[PDB]
Amino acid sequence: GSVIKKRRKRMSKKKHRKLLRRTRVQRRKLGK
RNA sequence: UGUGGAGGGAGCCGUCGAAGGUGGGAUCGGCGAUUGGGACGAAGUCGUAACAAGGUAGCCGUACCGGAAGGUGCGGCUGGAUC
Structure with missing residues (x-):
């Protein structure tokens, strides 16, 4: 087994994940 | 015998009725100032995270954080090395 x-x-x-941390606001308060 | 009679047609009415209109919706595409991340790039900046115990062992899931690779905590695995 490798790890690459x-x-x-x-x-x-x-x-x-970090993208979602940064867009946690806009996604919610846009896509309703 | 007579503008007689059935009877029929014209004509008219109604059912169904395409197309035309009104209506709010479905679905499918395109555009879209701006904003993402994705690939490749010549050559550059920032660092050293990883590969040998890669110099704090890595890795999985998760939470928080951080200019960036990444760091820490909880549990777990060896696909972890010496003795």
């Missing part, structure tokens, strides 16, 4: 794969996975996950 899991790391690329992890990075995509993290960037999407």
Whole structure:
């Protein structure tokens, strides 16, 4: 088993997560 | 025998009636000032996060935080090394 794969996975996950932290307001108070 | 009679038609009325209109909706596309992140880039800036115990072992899930890689906490795994 390697960890390169899991790391690329992890990075995509993290960037999407931080994007959601930054847009937690706009998503809610836009898409109603 | 007579403008007689059935009877029929014209004509008219009603049912159904396409197209035309009104109506608020569905669905499908396009545009959209601005805003995202995605790929590639020549060559550059910021750092050293990772690979050897990568110099704080990494990694999974989650929460918080941070200029950025990332850091810390709780639990877990070895796909973790020496003795």
